Amino acid sequence: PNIVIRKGELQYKVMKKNKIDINQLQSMLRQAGSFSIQEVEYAIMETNGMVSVLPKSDFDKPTNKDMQIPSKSVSLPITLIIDGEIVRDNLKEAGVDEQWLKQEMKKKNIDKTEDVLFAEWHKNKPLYTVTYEQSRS
């Protein structure tokens, strides 16, 4: 992983060696969001021949910390039911069981668990369900 721009400075030695000129690098930067080399702090040529860009502070976008937004819960959703069939492994991974499903089926007026095309569990959300009815609509 060679560094083609270090601390805002074009590194001509490794550009030659990695066989990329200016026109090519400029084009690779624009596909990553940086429209001039003046806005770039770090640029790294990768294995697959892609460029990774760390923009200079002033041109970067603000993170959650920078805007003092309180640290929030970040979690993946879990697919409980797919195509009318309950997914086995995903029940215990979400720490739920078939009792919880049927209680939540009745909470949204659903009759069997094969009436449901798709259902997903999210930590900070109600249970999401797409019925076979809802999918013709």
Residues that bind a second copy (CB under 8 A): 1, 3, 6, 9-13, 22-24, 26-27, 30-31, 35-38, 41-42, 44, 46-48, 50, 52, 54-67, 69, 71-77, 79, 82, 117-118, 120, 122, 125, 128, 130, 134-137
> Smallest distance, Å, CB 11 to a second copy?
6
Cβ proximity to a second copy: between 54 and 97 the closer is 54
Please name the helix (run of DSSP H) or strand (run of DSSP E) that holds residue 16, with its range, or none.
Answer: helix 12-17
Distance in angstroms (rounded) separating the CA atoms of residues 12 and 98: 62
> Smallest distance, Å, CB 94 to a second copy?
13
Nearest to 58 by CA among 86, 36, 76, 73: 36
> Smallest distance, Å, CB 118 to a second copy?
6
- 117 in Cβ contact with 101 (< 8 Å): no
- 121 in Cβ contact with 77 (< 8 Å): yes
Cβ proximity to a second copy: between 22 and 98 the closer is 22
Cβ proximity to a second copy: between 99 and 109 the closer is 109
> Smallest distance, Å, CB 64 to a second copy?
5
Cβ proximity to a second copy: between 105 and 119 the closer is 119
Distance in angstroms (rounded) separating the CA atoms of residues 61 and 42: 15
Cβ proximity to a second copy: between 99 and 114 the closer is 114
Burial grade of 101 (CB within 10 A; 0-12, 13-18, 19 or more): buried
